[PDB]
C-alpha cells in the first residue's frame, strides 16, 4: 500500500525519490530516507555502533587513511611554499606560532628524545614528509615535546577531557541509541576534548593567550545540558570579562595577581594545570547527583576553593558564597524528589500513556520505564511524562548547581536552569500526571479499553532505532572488563565495573 | 451587556477608557483597543493591507513627504554648521566617512555621470538643498556613484535582500494576516535589507570594516526562525571571532589570506560580492524544503564551497564537514515526516480541537486546515497541534540545516534548533494527538457531542484579523502577473506564477 | 511508613541520610532536606521571613559583625602591604583607582566635612583601622565625599534602585513566599542596586568608564522577567556597541556628541544623572500595566525622549519610532485581555484543576485564585492555567514594551517577549482551558466526582511554603504605615498605602 511519501506525492505532484539524489523536495514530504555510508564504531557496542567516515579526523589512530592526491617527499620549507598558495591561513597561523617563529619563543627548554628543540617545528615534523603517508596527530605527537601538559591532560577521571570520547561517547546511551549521522557533533565535541590539544589553544597558532579566554571553553561548555558559559557570562565576573577583554593583558600567565577578572581557565586550570577536573570537590554527574560540598568530609576541597577566591576577595566572603551554593543546591533537590514521586507514581498505577510496552524498545532492547532502575532516562522516543522528568533532573536541577557555582544571581533564581524554571517544570509534570489520571479514571468508569496510539511505537524515525536490533551476545563485555579506563554503569554491561 | 473591560472596571474601580488616552490601566484590563492611524499598504493585498505612517522611512519612494519645520535653501557647509548643533552624531559620522573626508579616501575612481567625484559628498548631495523638499534615499541614490555594488545588491532571487520587502513582506501570509502595528518590525527589517545600503555598513560612516563583522548581519539573521548568528557564534569560528575581534585588522578586504577567522561576510560576500545569496547551492525556504547539497547535480556548488573552506583548511576536511551536513539534514526530515503524518492523521480522523471551522478564518478567508495544501501554516489563531507542527518544520527542522552549515556541534545535537529539540517537539506533537484521540474516543462511547470553545473563534485580538474581511475580487492579481519580480505561491494569487 | 527516601534507599542500596552530611546521593533520591542556618529577615513579614547569614554583606547596617581572625590597629600603608600578599587583586584595583592614585585624579573638588580631600583614600578610610572592628560600607560612606551622586541614587521611586531591597525584596510576594535559600540571589541583586555604589562601577577600581558600558547593567537587567539587555543587544544600537566597543573612547563623559553608539547609561543616566528612573514617562510595573506614552498628557516626557534621540537622529524619525512603541504596546494588550478572559472564565465555571482549595495555600495563607483581586499571581505552586497566565502578562506582554522601547525589530515580532510568542502562549492557554472544559463535561455527564490529585497540595517542597504557617497578627503593619518609603499593595498589608 501507499507510504506517507506516496500519498504526499499524489497530492503535491512531486515524484517519490531518494533523499540523496539532489531533488528539492517540497517540505521533504516525498523523500525516502537512505542510510549514509558508515564505518564501524568502537567500544562495547561495536557490534552495531556506526560512525560517519569523517571520524577519521577525530579518532585518527583507528580510522585515518591516506586520501591526498598530491605525491612527493618534501622538506619543511617546501610544505610552506606550496601551502602558502593552497591553504594560506594554515601557513599564516604557523608563521605566527612559536613552532614556526623563533622570535616569539620564551626559552621554555623544550626537548625531544632528551635533546633541545632549537629548530623550527614545521609541517613535516608534525604531519610527516611523504604526502601519500601524511599523519593526522593526537596528543601522542605533542607528548614528544610537551610531556608535562600531556600527562596532566591524561590524568582526569570519568567526566573529564581524558575519557570524554573513549568512555563517554562509546559507552553513552544517548549516543549508542541513535543513528550515527544524528550525533556526529557529539562524537567530535567529546573527541576534540580527549584526543586533541587544540580545543583551547587552536591550531595552527597554538596560542596560550587565546586558551585563557572563556571563548576557549564555551563552544563545548554551554547549553541546557551544562550551561556554565551562560552562568559565568551572567555573573559580574562575566560582565567584567566582556568589559575588559579588549584592553586587558591576556599574555600574562594564569597566576595570583596577574588578572583582575577570573575566567574558566583561571579557576579551573589553576596555575596552568592541564587536568582541570581535579579542583572539583567530587564528580556528581553534572549536579544530577546531590552532594553538600560544604560538609566536614569535603573541607580540604572547600578550603582550596576559598583560597582560590582569596586571590581577589575576603575568604569569609568566598566561604559565604560557596555556602549559598550548598544551601541552594539542597533546596533544589526537594523539587526533583517531588517530580520523581509523581512520575514513578504514575508508572506504578499504570496510567502513563504510552506505557513502556507501547513505545519502541529502549536502546538495550527493553520495554522498560525510563525513570526506574535499569531504564534509560531520556527526552526522545518516550512518554511526555518521562521527557519532562529527564528535563527536570538534567536540564534544570543540574544547572542550579552551575548557576550557584558561577555566581549567576539571575540564573539561580529566575533564569535558565533556575529555581523558578524548576517550579514551572514541576507544574508541567503534575499537569501531565493529572491529565493521565483523569483519562484513566474516566476510561475505567465507562469500561473503555484504551490502547496507546501506534505512533508511540512505529514511525520513520522510530523504526531506525537500535533497540529493535538488539540481541543476546551483542555486547563486547571484554571492553567493560578493562581496568585501564573507567566505565558507565550500563544495564547490559554484563560484568563488574 | 458588559464587556470584559466593563466587568474589570466594576471590580478594580478604574473606569473603562480608550487605550490611547494616557491613563495607566491596571493590568490593561479596562482599556479598549483603538485602531492606530494607518496608511494603505502596497502589493497584491493593497485592498486591505495597512502600514503605520512611519513606513515613510523604509519605502520612501511611495510614502515620503516633507515633514520639516526648518525653511531655506542651503549649501553643504551650512547643513554641517547647523546639524553640528542639532544632530551632532550625524555630522561626526559624516566627518569620519570618505564622503566627508578626503584624507581617508582610497582613490577608488568613483564617478557620477561619467565624471570623477573629487569633492566632498555632503548632506545636500544626498538629501537635497531645500529643507522643505528633503529627500530620503534608497539604493537608487547610491547607484549614481556605486553602480557595481548596487547592481549586485539588486541581483538576488526570492529569499535574498533584493526582494525582501517588495515580495516577502507585501505577499507574505504572516505579514498580511495581522494588524499593521503588530508587524512593523517585519516591514522594516525586510525593507532595510532591500531598499537601503546601510544594513551592514551603517549610516553615516558607511565603513566597510564595520560591514565585515558578524554584527553587520546578526540583528536580522537571528532567532528561532533562522538562527544562523547563534549557529555561527557557537562554532569554533564564532568563538575565535569573539577572541580576536578586539585586536585583528578589520581594515583588510575580504580575500583569501587576509583573515584567520571567517565571518558571515567572508563566506557569503566572497571577495566583496554584494549578492551574497548567489553562493548558496539552492534556495530551500530556509531548510524547510529538503535537498541533498552533496548530490551529483550540485557538484559545482559543493566544489565551490570546498574551495572557499580551503582558504584555511584541507579540502578533504571541508568535504567531510559538508557531507556531515547532508547526512544530518536527511536524518532530520524523518522526524518531520513522522510529525506530519501524526498531525494530518488527526485532521483526517476529525479529532483536532478546534477543527478549522471552529477557529477564526485564515487570512485567505477560509476555514482550512493549516497543514494541508491550500492552508496557511502558522503558530497563531490555530490549534495547538497545528502550532506544534509549524514549530517542528520552521523553528527546528530548518535550523538543523543552519546548525550543520555553520559547524555548531552543540546546536546540531543538543541545542536550539537541534536533533534533540526535534525529538522533544515530536513527543509534544504525539502527546497532543494522543490527548485529542482519547477525548474523541470517550465522547463517542458516551454519546457526548463536543463543540469546540467559542474562544477558538472569537476574542478581542481574533476579531481584528483580516480573514473576517476577505471577499471576492479583493486581490490585485495584476501584481501577481508581474514577471519583473518573483512571487510567493499564495492560494488566492489567482494566476500563474 | 516509608517515605520516598526510604523506598528509594531499598531499591538503590544507598542509606537514607541528611542532605548536608557530604554523601554523594544517587540522583538525590535518599537525601532528606535539612533547614539551613538562618537569620531573621526584616520588613513587614519579619515574623517569619528569613535570610541566609550571608545577608551580612548586602544589608550590613542590620547584619554585619566582626568575623576576622586578624588582630591589630593599622595605618593605611600597612593595610596595603599585607593585602598585597593576602588579597592581591583588591590592592591592584585600588592602586588603579583615583582613591589610591593621585596621577589619575581629575581635580573634581571632592570634600569631606567641608575640607578638600587631597590625600589617598585608603583601605582604612573606608573600612576602619581596627581589624577586629572592620566596617562593610553602603552608600552612606560614599555620601561623605560624593553627596551629589548619593542624593540622586536615593531620589528614585518604587521600581528604582532606591527601594529595590527595602521595599521590593522585603515586601515582595515571590520573595517572602519562598524558603530563604531559594531566593538569596533575589535579595542580593536588588540589595546591590539599592545599598551599594558598585553595581555599575565595580569595586575596587570604581571606574566610570566601566560604568558607561552595557556590561554595567546587564547582569541585573536581563531575562524573561525584564529582557532589556537582549532587546538592546538585538537592536542596531546593540550590534554597533559590539562592533565599536574595543576601539571607542569610553573615557568620554556621557554627553551629546561624545558617543556614536548609545548605551543603557547614555540614555538612562543622561548627563551622568544617578537617578536613571526619572527619565521614564511613568512607572508601569515593567509594562504589565498599559499606558500610551504618546498621549497628550505625557507630551513633556515624550518630547524629552525625542530630544535625547535627536543627539544622533531626526526628531521626526525618533517621534515615529516612539509612536511605533505606543501602537505595538496597545495591540499586545488585546492578546492579554483574551488570555485573562479565558483563564478567569475557567475559574468562574469551576473547571480549573486544581481549584485553589486543591493547592497549598498562597503566601498570605489563603486558598484564593491567583488571577483574581486579592490573589497572588505566580508561576509556582499553582495550576497550569494560572502559570501560563502569569507567563503571558509578565514574561511576554511586559517585554513587548521592552522590545519596542529598545528598537529590537526581531524581538518585537518573532523573538523572546514578542507578539508571536504572545500568540503561541495564547494558543497554550486556550489549549489548557479546552482540556479542562472537556474533562469537566465528560465527568458531569457520566457522574464521576473528580478530586484533584494530592500532589497539587502536598509534597517535599510544597510543605516548606510559608502559607501553611500564616496566622492572624503575624504582619508588622507599622512597617506599611511608614510614609518615608513607598509600599506594595499586598492583600494583608492591613492599612492604607
Ligand atoms: C617538538 C618537536 C614539538 C612538538 C612535537 C610540538 N611542539 Fe609545541 N613547542 C615546541 C617548541 C620548540 C615551542 C617553543 C618553546 C619556547 O621556548 O618558547 C613550543 C611551544 C608550544 C606552545 C606555547 C606557544 C606559545 O606561543 O606560548 C604550545 C601551546 C604548544 N607548543 C603546543 C603544541 C601542541 C598542541 C602540539 C601537538 C599537536 C605540539 N606543541 C607539538 C616544540 C614542539
Ligand atoms: C572562578 C571564579 C570560576 C570561574 C571564572 C568559572 N568557574 Fe567553573 N566552577 C567554579 C567553582 C567554585 C565550581 C564548583 C566546584 C566545587 O567543587 O565546589 C565550578 C564548577 C564548574 C564545573 C563543574 C565541575 C565539577 O562538578 O566538579 C564546570 C564543568 C565548570 N565549572 C566550568 C567552567 C567554565 C566552562 C567556565 C567559563 C565559562 C567557568 N567554569 C568559570 C569556579 C569558577
Ligand atoms: C584547555 C582545556 C586546554 C587544553 C585541552 C590544552 N591546553 Fe595547553 N594551555 C591551556 C591554557 C589555558 C594555557 C596557559 C596556561 C597558563 O599557565 O597561563 C596553556 C599552555 C600550554 C603550553 C605552554 C606552557 C608554558 O610553559 O608556557 C603548552 C606547551 C601547552 N599548553 C600544551 C598543551 C598540550 C600538549 C595539550 C594536549 C595534551 C594541551 N596544551 C591541551 C589550555 C589547554
Ligand atoms: C572606599 C573608597 C574603599 C576603599 C578605599 C577600599 N574599599 Fe574595600 N570595599 C568598599 C566597599 C563599599 C565594599 C562593600 C562591597 C561593595 O561593592 O560595595 C568593600 C568590600 C571589601 C571587601 C569584601 C568584599 C570582597 O570582595 O571580598 C574587602 C576584603 C575589602 N573591601 C578590602 C579592601 C582593602 C584591602 C582595601 C585597600 C587596598 C580596600 N578594601 C579599599 C570600599 C572601599
Ligand atoms: C557620488 C556623488 C556618491 C554618492 C551618491 C554616494 N557616494 Fe559613497 N563614495 C563616494 C566617494 C567619492 C567615496 C570615496 C571613494 C574613494 O576614493 O575612497 C565613496 C565611498 C563609499 C564607501 C566606502 C567607504 C570607505 O570608508 O571605504 C561606501 C561603503 C559608500 N561610499 C557607500 C555609499 C552609499 C551606501 C551611498 C548611498 C546612500 C553612497 N555611498 C552615495 C561617492 C558617492
Ligand atoms: C564560512 C565559514 C561561513 C561563515 C563564517 C558563515 N556561514 Fe552562512 N553558510 C555557510 C555555508 C557553507 C552554508 C550552506 C550553503 C550551501 O549551499 O551548502 C551557509 C548557509 C547560510 C545561509 C542559508 C543560505 C542558503 O540556504 O542558500 C544563510 C542565510 C547564512 N549562511 C548566513 C550566515 C550568517 C548571518 C553568518 C554570520 C553570522 C554566517 N552565515 C556565517 C558558510 C558560512
Ligand atoms: C551587507 C549585506 C551589505 C550590504 C547590504 C551592502 N554592503 Fe557595501 N559592503 C559590504 C561589505 C562586507 C564590504 C567590504 C567588502 C570587501 O570586499 O571587503 C562593502 C564594501 C562596499 C564599498 C567599498 C567598495 C570598494 O571598492 O572598496 C562600497 C562602495 C559599498 N560597499 C557600497 C554599497 C552600496 C551602494 C550598497 C547598496 C546597494 C551596499 N554597499 C550594500 C556589505 C554590504
Ligand atoms: C605540530 C606542532 C603541527 C605543525 C607544525 C603543523 N600542524 Fe597541521 N595539524 C596539527 C594537528 C595536531 C592537527 C589535527 C587537528 C587538531 O586540531 O589537533 C593538524 C591538522 C592539519 C590539517 C587538517 C585540518 C584542517 O584544518 O584542514 C592540515 C591540512 C594541516 N594540519 C596542515 C599543516 C600545514 C600545511 C602545516 C605547516 C604550515 C602544519 N599543518 C603545521 C599539528 C601541526
Ligand atoms: C572621601 C574620603 C571619599 C570617600 C568616602 C569615597 N571617595 Fe570616591 N573619590 C574621592 C576622591 C578624592 C576622588 C578623586 C577625585 C578627583 O579629583 O579625581 C574620588 C573619585 C571617585 C570616583 C571617580 C573615579 C574615576 O576614576 O573617575 C568614583 C566613581 C568614586 N570616587 C566612587 C566612590 C564610592 C562608590 C565610594 C563609596 C564606597 C567612594 N567613592 C568613597 C574621595 C572619596
Ligand atoms: C537610548 C537609545 C536607550 C538605550 C541605549 C537603552 N534604552 Fe532603556 N529605554 C529607552 C526608552 C526610550 C525607554 C522607554 C521609556 C519611556 O518612558 O518611553 C526605555 C525603557 C527602559 C526601561 C523601563 C523604564 C520605564 O518603564 O520607565 C528600563 C529598565 C531600561 N530601559 C533599561 C535599559 C538597559 C538596561 C539598557 C542597556 C542594556 C537600555 N535600557 C538601553 C531608551 C534606551
Ligand atoms: C549605575 C546605575 C551606577 C550606580 C548605581 C552608581 N553610579 Fe556612579 N557613575 C555611573 C556612571 C555611568 C558614571 C559616569 C557618568 C558620566 O557622566 O559619564 C558615574 C560616575 C560617577 C562619579 C564621577 C563623577 C564625576 O564628577 O566625574 C562618581 C563620584 C560616582 N559615579 C559615584 C557614585 C556613588 C557615590 C554612587 C552610589 C551612591 C554611584 N556612583 C552609583 C554609574 C553608576
Ligand atoms: C549620502 C552619501 C548621504 C550623505 C552625504 C548624508 N546622508 Fe543622511 N542619510 C542617507 C541615507 C541613504 C539615509 C536613509 C537611511 C538609511 O540608512 O539608508 C539618511 C538618513 C538621514 C536622516 C534620517 C535618519 C536618522 O537617523 O534620523 C537624517 C536626519 C540625515 N540623514 C541627515 C544628514 C545630514 C545632516 C548629513 C550631513 C552631515 C547627511 N545626512 C549626510 C545618506 C546620506
Q: Which three cell numbers stand for residue C162?
A: 532606591
Q: Helix, strand, or coil here: C266?
A: helix
Quickly count helices (H) and strands (E) in chain B.
Answer: 20, 6
Separation between Cα atoms, residue C40 and residue C344, nearest integer Å: 37
Please tell me whether the peptide bond between A354 and the residue prior to it is cis, using omega within 30 degrees of 0.
yes
Sole residue written with cell 541546557: A224
Q: Please give the span between the terminal C-alpha atoms of chain A, in angstroms, as a whole number.
A: 49
Contact A282, C58 (CB under 8 A): no
Distance from CA of A483 to the nearest CA of B (A): 31
> Of all protein residues, whose CA lies closest to atom 10 belonging to ligand 6?
B405
DSSP one-letter code for C455: G
Give CB contacts under 8 A, 24+ apart, made by C7-13.
C11/A373, C12/A373
Separation between Cα atoms, residue A118 and residue B281, nearest integer Å: 48
Q: Is C232 in the pocket of ligand 10 (CB under 6 A)?
A: yes
Calculated CA dihedral for residues A341, A346, A352, A357, nearest 10 degrees: 90
Q: Helix, strand, or coil here: B103?
A: helix
- Total count of residues recorded for chain A: 497
C-alpha A123 to ligand 8 mean position (Å): 7
Residue ranges with strand state E in A202-353 = none
Contacts A327 to C, Cβ<8 Å: 36, 52, 181, 184
Residues in contact with B119: Cβ distance below 8 Å, sequence separation at least 6, in sequence order = none
Separation between Cα atoms, residue C11 and residue C27, nearest integer Å: 13
Sole residue written with cell 552530611: C21
Contacts A189 to B, Cβ<8 Å: 409-410, 413
Q: Which three cell numbers stand for residue C166?
A: 527595602
Separation between Cα atoms, residue C422 and residue B34, nearest integer Å: 19
Domain boundaries of chain C, sorted by first residue: 1-207, 208-497
**CA angle in degrees (0–180, nearest 5) for C276-C279-C283:** 90
Sign, CA torsion C180/C183/C188/C194: negative
Sole residue written with cell 554523594: C24
> Which residue precedes each gap in chain B (C to N above 2.5 Å)?
none
Nearest to C424 among B24, B53, B387 (CB): B387
Q: Which three cell numbers stand for residue B431?
A: 502527546
Residue of A nearest to C201 (CA): A240
Separation between Cα atoms, residue C343 and residue B27, nearest integer Å: 14
Contacts C311 to B, Cβ<8 Å: 87-89
Q: Which three cell numbers stand for residue A434?
A: 493529572
Q: Please give the span between the terminal C-alpha atoms of chain C, in angstroms, as a whole number.
A: 49
Radius of gyration of chain C (CA): 26
Q: Which chains have 3+ CB pairs within 8 A of A? A: B, C
Contacts C424 to B, Cβ<8 Å: 379-380, 387, 391
> Of all protein residues, whose CA lies closest to atom 14 belonging to ligand 11?
C208
Q: CA dist B278 to B160, B269, B329, Å?
A: 9, 9, 21
Q: Helix, strand, or coil here: C479?
A: helix
Residues in contact with B489: Cβ distance below 8 Å, sequence separation at least 6, in sequence order = B497
Contacts B223 to C, Cβ<8 Å: 410, 414-415
Q: Is B137 in the pocket of ligand 12 (CB under 6 A)?
A: yes
The method of structure determination was X-ray
Q: Which three cell numbers stand for residue A424?
A: 514551572
Residues in contact with A461: Cβ distance below 8 Å, sequence separation at least 6, in sequence order = B331, B334, B335, B338, B426
The closest of A245, A277, A278 to A263, measured between CA atoms, is A245
Residues facing residue A40 across a β-bridge: A50
CB pairs under 8 A between A and C: 223
Binding-site residues of B, in ranges, read 79, 82-83, 99, 123, 126-127, 131, 142, 145-146, 161, 186, 189-190, 197, 200-201, 204, 217, 220-221, 226, 237, 264, 267-268, 274, 309, 312-313, 406, 414
Q: Which three cell numbers stand for residue B353?
A: 480541537
The closest of B234, B262, B235 to B248, measured between CA atoms, is B262
> Of all protein residues, whose CA lies closest to atom 25 belonging to ligand 3?
A108
Q: How far is CA B449 from the centre of its chain?
A: 43
- Ligand 6 pocket, Cβ-based, cut-off 6 angstroms: B 214, 217-218, 221, 228-229, 232, 237, 262-264, 266-268, 280-281, 284, 293, 301, 305, 405-406
Separation between Cα atoms, residue A263 and residue A257, nearest integer Å: 13
Experimental resolution (Å): 1.8
Q: What b/e sequence results for C149-175 when a residue is b if at least 16 CB atoms lie within 10 Å of its CB, and e otherwise?
A: bbebbbebebbbbbbbbbbbbbbbbbb
Burial status of residue B296 (CB atoms within 10 A of its CB: 0-12, 13-18, 19 or more): exposed
Separation between Cα atoms, residue C70 and residue A138, nearest integer Å: 51
Q: CA dist B167 to B225, B392, C233, Å?
A: 18, 25, 28
Residue A126, annotated ligand binder? yes
Separation between Cα atoms, residue A228 and residue B75, nearest integer Å: 58
Mutation probe of ligand 7 site: the residue of B208, B221, B262 with most atoms within 8 A of C-beta: B208
Nearest to C28 among A290, A320, A419 (CB): A290
Sign, CA torsion C327/C328/C331/C337: negative
Q: Which three cell numbers stand for residue C220?
A: 541585573
Nearest to A413 among C186, C219, C442 (CB): C186
Separation between Cα atoms, residue C137 and residue C57, nearest integer Å: 9
Separation between Cα atoms, residue A215 and residue A136, nearest integer Å: 25
Residue of C nearest to A341 (CA): C4
Q: Which three cell numbers stand for residue B166?
A: 517588495
C-alpha C329 to ligand 12 mean position (Å): 29
Separation between Cα atoms, residue B374 and residue B390, nearest integer Å: 15
DSSP one-letter code for C35: P
Would the CB atoms of C453 and A446 count as touching at under 8 Å?
Answer: no
Contact B492, B374 (CB under 8 A): no
Amino acid at each position: 500500500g501507499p507510504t506517507f511519501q506516496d500519498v504526499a506525492s499524489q497530492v503535491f505532484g512531486q515524484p517519490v525519490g531518494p533523499d540523496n539524489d539532489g531533488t528539492l523536495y517540497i517540505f521533504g514530504l516525498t523523500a525516502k530516507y537512505t542510510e549514509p555510508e558508515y564505518v564501524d564504531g568502537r567500544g562495547p557496542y561495536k557490534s552495531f555502533l556506526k560512525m560517519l567516515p569523517s571520524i577519521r579526523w577525530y579518532d585518527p589512530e583507528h580510522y585515518w587513511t591516506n586520501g591526498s592526491q598530491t605525491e612527493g617527499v618534501f622538506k619543511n620549507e617546501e610544505c610552506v611554499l606550496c601551502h602558502t598558495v593552497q591553504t594560506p591561513t594554515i601557513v599564516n597561523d604557523w608563521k605566527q606560532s612559536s613552532h614556526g617563529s623563533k622570535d616569539i619563543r620564551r626559552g621554555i627548554g623544550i626537548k625531544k628524545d632528551g635533546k633541545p628543540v632549537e629548530d623550527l617545528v614545521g609541517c613535516a615534523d608534525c604531519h610527516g614528509n611523504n604526502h601519500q603517508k601524511l599523519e593526522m596527530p593526537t596528543y601522542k605527537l605533542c607528548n614528544d615535546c610537551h610531556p608535562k601538559e600531556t600527562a596532566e591532560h591524561r590524568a582526569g577521571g570519568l567526566g573529564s577531557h581524558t575519557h570524554a570520547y573513549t568512555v563517554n561517547v562509546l559507552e553513552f546511551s544517548w549516543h549508542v541509541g541513535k543513528p550515527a549521522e544524528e550525533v556526529t557533533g557529539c562524537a567530535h565535541c567529546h573527541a576534540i576534548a580527549e584526543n586533541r590539544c587544540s580545543g583551547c589553544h587552536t591550531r595552527h597558532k597554538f596560542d596560550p593567550a587565546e586558551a585563557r579566554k572563556p571563548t576557549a571553553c564555551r563552544v563545548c561548555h554551554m547549553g541546557i545540558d551544562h550551561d556554565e558559559w551562560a552562568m559565568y557570562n551572567t555573573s559580574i565576573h562575566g560582565a567584567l570579562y566582556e568589559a575588559e577583554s579588549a584592553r586587558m593583558d591576556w599574555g600574562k600567565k594564569l597566576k595570583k595577581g596577574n588578572y583582575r577578572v577570573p575566567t574558566c581557565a583561571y579557576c579551573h586550570m589553576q596555575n596552568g594545570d592541564h587536568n582541570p577536573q581535579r579542583f572539583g570537590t567530587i564528580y556528581s554527574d553534572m549536579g544530577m547527583f546531590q552532594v553538600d560540598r560544604g560538609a566536614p568530609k569535603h573541607k580540604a576541597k572547600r578550603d582550596s576553593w576559598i583560597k582560590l577566591c582569596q586571590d581577589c576577595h575576603s575568604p569569609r566572603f568566598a566561604a559565604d558564597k560557596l555556602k549559598e551554593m550548598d544551601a541552594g543546591v539542597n533546596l533544589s533537590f526537594t523539587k526533583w524528589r517531588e517530580a520523581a514521586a509523581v512520575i514513578v507514581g504514575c508508572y506504578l498505577d499504570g496510567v502513563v500513556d504510552p506505557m513502556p510496552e507501547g513505545s519502541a524498545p529502549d536502546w538495550y532492547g527493553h520495554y522498560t520505564f525510563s525513570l526506574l532502575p535499569g531504564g534509560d532516562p531520556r527526552f526522545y522516543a518516550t512518554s511526555n511524562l518521562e521527557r519532562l522528568g529527564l528535563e527536570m533532573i538534567c536540564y534544570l536541577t543540574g544547572n542550579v548547581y552551575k548557576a550557584y557555582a558561577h555566581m549567576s544571581m539571575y540564573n539561580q533564581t529566575y533564569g535558565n536552569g533556575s529555581a523558578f524554571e524548576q517550579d514551572r517544570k514541576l507544574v508541567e509534570i503534575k499537569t501531565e500526571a493529572a491529565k493521565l489520571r483523569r483519562f484513566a479514571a474516566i476510561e475505567k468508569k465507562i469500561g473503555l479499553e484504551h490502547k496507546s496510539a501506534d505512533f508511540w511505537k512505529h514511525g520513520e524515525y522510530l523504526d531506525l532505532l537500535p533497540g529493535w536490533k538488539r540481541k543476546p551476545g551483542d555486547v563486547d563485555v571484554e571492553w567493560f572488563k578493562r581496568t585501564d579506563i573507567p566505565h558507565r554503569a550500563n544495564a547490559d554491561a554484563g560484568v563488574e565495573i
